Amino acid sequence: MNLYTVIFINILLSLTLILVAFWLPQMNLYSEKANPYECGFDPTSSARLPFSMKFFLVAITFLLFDLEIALLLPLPWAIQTIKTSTMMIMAFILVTILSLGLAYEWTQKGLEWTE
Amino acid sequence: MELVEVLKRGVQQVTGHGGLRGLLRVFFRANDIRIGTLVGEDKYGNKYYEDNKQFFGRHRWVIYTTEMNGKNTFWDVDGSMVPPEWHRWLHCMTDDPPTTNPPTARKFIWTNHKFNVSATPEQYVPYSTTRKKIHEWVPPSTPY
Amino acid sequence: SRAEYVVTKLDDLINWARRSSLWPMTFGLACCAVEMMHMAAPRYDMDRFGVVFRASPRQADVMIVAGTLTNKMAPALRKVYDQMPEPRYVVSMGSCANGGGYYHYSYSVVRGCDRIVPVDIYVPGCPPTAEALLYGILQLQRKIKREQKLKIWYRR
Amino acid sequence: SKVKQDMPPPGGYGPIDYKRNLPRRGLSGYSMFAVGIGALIFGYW
Amino acid sequence: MFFINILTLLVPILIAMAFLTLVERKILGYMQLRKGPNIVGPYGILQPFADAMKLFMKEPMRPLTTSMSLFIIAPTLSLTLALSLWVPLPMPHPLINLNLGILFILATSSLSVYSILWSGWASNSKYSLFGALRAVAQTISYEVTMAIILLSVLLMNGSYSLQTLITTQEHMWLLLPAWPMAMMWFISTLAETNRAPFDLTEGESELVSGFNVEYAAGPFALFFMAEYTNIILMNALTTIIFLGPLYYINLPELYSTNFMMEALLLSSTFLWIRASYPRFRYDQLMHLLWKNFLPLTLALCMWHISLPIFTAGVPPYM
Amino acid sequence: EVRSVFPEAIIIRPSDIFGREDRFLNHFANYRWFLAVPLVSLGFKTVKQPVYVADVSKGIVNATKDPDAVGKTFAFTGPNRYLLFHLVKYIFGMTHRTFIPYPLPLFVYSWIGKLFGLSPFEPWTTKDKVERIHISDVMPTDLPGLEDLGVQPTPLELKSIEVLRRHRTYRWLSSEIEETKPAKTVNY
Amino acid sequence: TYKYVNKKEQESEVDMKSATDNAARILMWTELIRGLGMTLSYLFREPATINYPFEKGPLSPRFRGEHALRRYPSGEERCIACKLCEAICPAQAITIEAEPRADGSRRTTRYDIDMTKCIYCGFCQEACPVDAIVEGPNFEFSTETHEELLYNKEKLLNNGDKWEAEIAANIQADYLYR
Ligand SMILES: CCCCCCCCCCCCCCCCCC(=O)OC[C@H](COP(=O)(O)OCCN)OC(=O)CCCCCCCCCCCCCCCCC
Ligand code: SF4
Ligand code: SF4
Numbered sequence A: 001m002n003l004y005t006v007i008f009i010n011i012l013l014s015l016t017l018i019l020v021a022f023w024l025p026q027m028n029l030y031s032e033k034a035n036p037y038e039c040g041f042d043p044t045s046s047a048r049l050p051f052s053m054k055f056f057l058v059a060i061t062f063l064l065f066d067l068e069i070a071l072l073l074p075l076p077w078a079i080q081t082i083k084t085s086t087m088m089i090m091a092f093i094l095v096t097i098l099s100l101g102l103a104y105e106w107t108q109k110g111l112e113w114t115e
Numbered sequence B: 001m002e003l004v005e006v007l008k009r010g011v012q013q014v015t016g017h018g019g020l021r022g023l024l025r026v027f028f029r030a031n032d033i034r035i036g037t038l039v040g041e042d043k044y045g046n047k048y049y050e051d052n053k054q055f056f057g058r059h060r061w062v063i064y065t066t067e068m069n070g071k072n073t074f075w076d077v078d079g080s081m082v083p084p085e086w087h088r089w090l091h092c093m094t095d096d097p098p099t100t101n102p103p104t105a106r107k108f109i110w111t112n113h114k115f116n117v118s119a120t121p122e123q124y125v126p127y128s129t130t131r132k133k134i135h136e137w138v139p140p141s142t143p144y
Numbered sequence C: 001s002r003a004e005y006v007v008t009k010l011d012d013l014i015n016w017a018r019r020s021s022l023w024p025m026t027f028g029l030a031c032c033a034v035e036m037m038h039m040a041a042p043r044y045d046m047d048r049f050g051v052v053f054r055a056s057p058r059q060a061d062v063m064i065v066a067g068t069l070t071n072k073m074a075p076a077l078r079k080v081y082d083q084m085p086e087p088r089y090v091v092s093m094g095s096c097a098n099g100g101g102y103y104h105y106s107y108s109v110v111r112g113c114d115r116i117v118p119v120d121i122y123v124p125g126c127p128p129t130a131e132a133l134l135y136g137i138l139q140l141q142r143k144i145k146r147e148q149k150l151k152i153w154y155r156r
Numbered sequence D: 001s002k003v004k005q006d007m008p009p010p011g012g013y014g015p016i017d018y019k020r021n022l023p024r025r026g027l028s029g030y031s032m033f034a035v036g037i038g039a040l041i042f043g044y045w
Numbered sequence E: 001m002f003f004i005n006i007l008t009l010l011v012p013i014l015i016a017m018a019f020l021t022l023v024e025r026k027i028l029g030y031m032q033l034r035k036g037p038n039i040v041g042p043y044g045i046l047q048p049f050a051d052a053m054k055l056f057m058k059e060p061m062r063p064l065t066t067s068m069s070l071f072i073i074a075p076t077l078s079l080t081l082a083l084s085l086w087v088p089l090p091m092p093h094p095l096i097n098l099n100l101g102i103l104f105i106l107a108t109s110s111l112s113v114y115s116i117l118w119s120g121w122a123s124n125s126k127y128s129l130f131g132a133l134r135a136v137a138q139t140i141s142y143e144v145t146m147a148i149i150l151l152s153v154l155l156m157n158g159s160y161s162l163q164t165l166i167t168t169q170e171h172m173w174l175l176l177p178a179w180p181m182a183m184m185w186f187i188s189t190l191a192e193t194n195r196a197p198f199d200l201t202e203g204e205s206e207l208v209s210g211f212n213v214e215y216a217a218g219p220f221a222l223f224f225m226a227e228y229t230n231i232i233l234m235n236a237l238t239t240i241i242f243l244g245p246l247y248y249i250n251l252p253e254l255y256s257t258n259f260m261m262e263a264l265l266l267s268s269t270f271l272w273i274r275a276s277y278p279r280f281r282y283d284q285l286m287h288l289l290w291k292n293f294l295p296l297t298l299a300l301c302m303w304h305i306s307l308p309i310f311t312a313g314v315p316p317y318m
Numbered sequence F: 001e002v003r004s005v006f007p008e009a010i011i012i013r014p015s016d017i018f019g020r021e022d023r024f025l026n027h028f029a030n031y032r033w034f035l036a037v038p039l040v041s042l043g044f045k046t047v048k049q050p051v052y053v054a055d056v057s058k059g060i061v062n063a064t065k066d067p068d069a070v071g072k073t074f075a076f077t078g079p080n081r082y083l084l085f086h087l088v089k090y091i092f093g094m095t096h097r098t099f100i101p102y103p104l105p106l107f108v109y110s111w112i113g114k115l116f117g118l119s120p121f122e123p124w125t126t127k128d129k130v131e132r133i134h135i136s137d138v139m140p141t142d143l144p145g146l147e148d149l150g151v152q153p154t155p156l157e158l159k160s161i162e163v164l165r166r167h168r169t170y171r172w173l174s175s176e177i178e179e180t181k182p183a184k185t186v187n188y
Numbered sequence G: 001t002y003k004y005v006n007k008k009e010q011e012s013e014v015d016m017k018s019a020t021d022n023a024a025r026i027l028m029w030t031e032l033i034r035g036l037g038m039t040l041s042y043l044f045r046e047p048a049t050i051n052y053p054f055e056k057g058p059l060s061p062r063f064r065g066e067h068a069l070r071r072y073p074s075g076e077e078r079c080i081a082c083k084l085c086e087a088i089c090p091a092q093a094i095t096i097e098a099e100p101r102a103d104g105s106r107r108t109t110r111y112d113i114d115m116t117k118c119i120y121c122g123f124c125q126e127a128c129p130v131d132a133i134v135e136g137p138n139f140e141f142s143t144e145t146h147e148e149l150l151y152n153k154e155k156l157l158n159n160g161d162k163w164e165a166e167i168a169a170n171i172q173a174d175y176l177y178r
């Protein structure tokens, strides 16, 4: 409950701070100040439109590498086992497999962006 | 060594403005302590110190007054309060202060300088210096 | 002691805050902006006074019209001034912006930013020495120092 | 009197340097790698 | 008394943020041949308070195109996470003794990204969304290396607890065993926190203040102090992990003092780095941190798996 | 008393004025933060003839120039007498939010106005504001008006969007005036 | 004559030593420690800044700032309404309207300068045949109103009676060049 308490304290700090920021100052609202910036001129279209991402393959392989992290992360407990050879070989195999996949992607120009 | 000598120089800086009162009066008010030579005092209170061992923006400086024309410049200081006799020496148009090479006296020159007046009363308001050009006809004060 | 005195000192505090931290905008149009840069530069450092630029007008407390204002660039200026959140101040910098300047009588010039934004302080020059712009900024500080808002609110 | 026009002095001015001078410095690289691997092996021991 | 402990952990960190802003400005000044703030206080020791007060007196911007819920909630989350990250920090005795502190840190930061990434979307505008997508790319870049670096480093500590590193470093630092992992960790802490040269989300000359262009007041201030709090956190992490100070069970305040010294050094190093270099490109960052850092990271992970074994240096589980 | 002490005066009597920063249309529109709008008698038995600001201003500005209008009153009313329920409905259609009205007696709505008037700042609602909202506009048929002074009254259906777009959300901000089914009127 | 800036003379000479040096440039950021050291050197230099209101920038007598209408040592008004300061003013900032003074003297009834049109060029003072209007040293005359920066004869004469002690010296210094 100590940790819950610390987090609630930080939460309430942030919310009290926002309450102050909103209800302490003065307001003069009108449509010409509440509309999006776009550098002095007006936008030509909405921002809720497609933004083509040109690193999507990199995103997906980041997901798979995240899973590889999740598999590598038990090693500090895997080392206090009696075998210490099966874990060695298996971790070697996992890392080498990941490196092989990275190399295939690299050579096939997956780390390059879709111009 | 030299660390001790710079500490001595800082001690002299701390202890060459009178006391704590006189030190804070300069430190909270100009954010500097650097001691120099008093060139001369003005007819309002300004002090116009000098130290040529510094470089060519700080070899000359001012310490303003706390009351120029009933305005309480202890905090609200402005560069319009340097009169022209010292303006020339402070902006480094000369190596010749007015305590040695003073200016010519003239009946029409202002004696008392005036700082910038922009929002106060006794500021400036423009107006046509000219006169009525097209005069009107004043009719008579009788009938028929 | 008195509520009015407490209000006066509180207003002194809020003015001190807004005065010791006024964040101008990266909004410069013409030559006068070069002297604005020179003010930002080492000799006449602005950050010494708590005056650092911010690119967005919403993270800004003041705008300095450092250049010539044209008929094609006036809507943008007004959009930017509008988007700035109040309290906000304007400094017209240079003859081209105080009045029309050297381009007063031309077809594509507005003859002062007075017609588009409300100016608090006028800085003359073509260009104005950054020394002079700095004087004008400290004069704007002095203007903020005497706002007397909560005083008059108490007296409503 | 005679004229005075801010001419240069008698004997020209000194030689102004204009060429680039970025001084090649630093260790060899063999030395740096030796230091690194030595720190590394001592740390492992 | 736990609440007084919360105070002694939270308020000094906020003053530290506030005066780090001053230190940043003044160090960048003197590197730039100028004096930073020396006016508002004696040597400018009140400019942070002035900035805060002035920011909380400005009118906040509630635009029309925005999604107000995410808009208001993102700075809240930002500061909350920046301030909860300081919780398990052993300096030397922590406030909250967790057994998986580094996983808490990792998850908390990967969630801290979502402040940027939802504020940018909620603030319906172009440069805002640019900053958001750049944050996505940045996290894609750095998260893998951060995790595998930290794994390789704790693979000679034996646990994810932060407090065990103090005993792992009772007679030495982990910088001499792992200076390469330390390099890459430093630059990934530099990619995290969105700090130059890896800024790329408030990149004022590429974007016009991304993910804050529509934020004006105390919300923007919250983002600001969240950034400047995460900076000190990451310096504290680097100096707890690699630059292990002296514990001395009778003299724990010595640990706290050396921790202070090293954290200040590394934070001033962040500011130095801001002053010195130009900005990367957010695709060049990917190319760097995939094609240079991840190969060597995996290779050195293999090395640090082998090393406990062929040296008989397997650490203990508590 | 102004007529007594300064005859040869001019007294302009406008109805509820509406403009960008008014306290009338924005006032009705700001009843969305509370989840419903109260209206005495459901808003019926109350009539409103609101005028645009620019018409009032032009009328004043011509009154300071017309040789007539020296000792005369004026009814700056605007056309299209609206009924309060339908006026608020048009507001809440232009501002595309919702419309959950409900009735409320004048005494409790007045008490609400009082406790909202306990405000050191510029309050939101007050007893006198409630009263002034819930008393019909007088028929101006015995006073000159704008047309006798040189101004065509601009109808509210022509200017409402300018002031009420501030309150529209995204999903309804970029929406036109011809999607609001204008208000039913009366003559009475 | 010309010269190449980024043209290698010739390539293809590498041994393990040069490879080690390049691989240590890489992997140690050696050409970045130089930038760090440069910025560190700059941290320990004297900053170029100045406490502005108390110590200021260096100017010369030729500096041209606020205007002024001067007088003779007798106090006589020095302008004569020859009306060419406005002939040459390339901003059309100056107006003059002149009459006889009832002493029988060519003098002005008007001397206005829209200092929001002035470009501070000096043409008026190098065109005046009597050294009447000058461009003085004051650069600290910012205002909170446009109307204050529209001057007339009285304001310019106030400036002259204020700044004569400076302007006389500046003129004494700069003549023999003009
Ligand atoms: C016993 C046998 C086994 C032993 C095994 C160990 C063998 C030795 C291992 C040495 C490896 C050291 C780690 C090197 C990682 C960097 C890899 C690299 O090549 O540099 C990356 C990047 C590339 O630069 P570039 O010129 O473009 O070359 C790339 C061409 N493909 O260049 C960059 O990253 C620069 C961009 C980032 C700039 C950020 C600013 C850095 C400022 C320097 C601060 C240094 C402070 C570090 C202190 C850390 C303390 C925790
Ligand atoms: S006033 Fe002069 S310096 Fe300034 S923008 Fe105009 S022409 Fe350029
Ligand atoms: S040129 Fe000189 S003398 Fe002639 S009108 Fe102008 S100021 Fe007067």
Ligand code: SF4
Pocket (backbone or CB within 6 Å): G085, G088, G089, G090, G091, G093, G094, G113, G117, G118, G119, G120, G121, G122, G123, G124, G125, G135
């Ligand atoms: S300095 Fe040039 S622009 Fe200014 S008034 Fe004189 S002639 Fe005109």
